[PDB]
Amino acid sequence: DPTIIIPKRANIPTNDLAARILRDVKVELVYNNSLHYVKIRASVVLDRPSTNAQTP
Amino acid sequence: RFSHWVKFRMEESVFAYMKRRSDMGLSMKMSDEDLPVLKSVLMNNPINIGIRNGGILTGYDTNKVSY
């Protein structure tokens, strides 16, 4: 989830107060890229061939 | 001959179910919730073929008791 973090007045340096400037506002995200390539492992057979049946 | 056939096929039918049920794990267990299935196991292989072929008798008598 994207997150936004903002400082408090106690953490702002006095020089920044004098200059009337706000610093260190931070944001974070994640990009959701797309697909480009696909590969397959097809197989052709003339027929088909352990029975554990126990929940892993 | 009938008695021998019934004996052999009952042993065969019980063993085959038990082994197949023990080969997947989940082996049979001695509990009231698992034992009744032997009713179906036995009723299936020998008895339901004997009735169809006519060797085993069925119906009601008069002795006043079912066959």
TrEMBL record, chain A:
This is Structural protein. The chain holds residues 407 to 465 of 473 of the full protein.
